[PDB]
Amino acid sequence: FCPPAKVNILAQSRPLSEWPINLVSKGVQEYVANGDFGTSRKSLDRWFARTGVPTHGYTTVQGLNLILRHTFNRYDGVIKKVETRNPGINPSIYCYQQVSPVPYNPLPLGTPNRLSIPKGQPGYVPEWQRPHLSTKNKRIRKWYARANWRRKPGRKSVLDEAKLKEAALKEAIPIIVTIGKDWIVMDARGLLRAVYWRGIAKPGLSLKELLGFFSGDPVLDPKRGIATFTFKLG
RNA sequence: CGCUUGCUCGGUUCGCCGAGACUCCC
DNA sequence: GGGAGAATTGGCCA
DNA sequence: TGGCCAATTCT
């Protein structure tokens, strides 16, 4: 079993459902045809351009075997499900080996000390009571974590999109997925928490060693602003 | 042994701390 | 209600 | 030479 993972995107060149891989994978399900489907580029040429369905400058052998082969199983199986008892046009951009994520180019502990920060600076712990806390090696939420600023009738807060949210991109961990013209930068601290949650120690993890524990084929979601990874057999 | 993002739920001096899952998608 | 790889290889110009 | 982007593969 491959456990899942969930990471947040940061920036995109153009609107989500406007990349040409999506513009190719979208019409396939509507179309489904010849049936001349093969990994070989020659067979792929025949199935797509020749049969009739338009291609938006896409010819990758993997990028057309992860959407055509999926669609036929989408048009099938449900018939088998109709047989078993006796639809959505997914822009789920299934990334492949050739577009595997790599860390950004032109691990830190975070807050090294909990009860030690100069007074008045951001992150400073309160003075009315420093003791009476708990020390069981639980997760540490950073001061800017909006999970700690949620609104309720009993809660008091002054939410600002700059003070709270812009503080994230300062110490973010960028990784890049490139299909040739479209670039997506996701936040890897989700992967950090996912790997520390299952048992792996801290500090031995660096660049080129976090992504290794996850599968190299993400499933980007050009809606909800989220991406999803999977681990390996380990 | 060990824990930067997301989310659910509390009160608080408003500075911040206490508990929890991650098999998610159509 | 279905999917969540990446090893080996073949063209390959500075 | 070797180095990288695509192209081919089984279960």
- Map chain A to HEC letters: CCCEEEEEEEECCCCHHHCHHHHHHHHHHHHCCCCCCCCCHHHHHHHHHHCCCCCCCCCCCCCCCCCHHHHHHHHCCHHHHHHHHCCCCCCCEECCHHHCCEECCCCCCCCCCCCCCCCCCCCCCCCCCCCCCCCCCCCCCCCCCHHHCCCCCCCCCCCCHHHHHCCCCCCCCEEEEECCCCEEEEECHHHHHHHHHHCCCCCCCCCCCCHHHECCCCEEECCCCEEEEEECCC
Q: Cβ of A100 < 7 Å from strand D?
A: no
Q: Cβ of A183 < 7 Å from strand B?
A: no
- A194 CA → B1 C1’, Å: 17
Q: Cβ of A2 < 7 Å from strand C?
A: yes
Residue A154 to residues A25, A133, A148, A150, A223, Cα–Cα distance (Å): 48, 21, 13, 11, 33
Nearest nt (C1') from A64 Cα: D7
| Residues A1-35: b if buried by 16+ CB within 10 A, e if exposed | eeeebebebeebeeebeebebbbbbeebbeeeeee
* Experimental determination technique: cryo-EM
Q: Which bases of strand B have any atom within 7 Å of the beta carbon of a protein residue?
A: 1-20, 22-26
Cβ A205 vs Cβ A85: under 8 Å: no
To one decimal, the resolution in angstroms is 3.8
The residue written with tokens 């048009």 in the block is: A75
Q: Which two tokens stand for residue A39?
A: 């990994």
Nearest nt (C1') from A168 Cα: B5
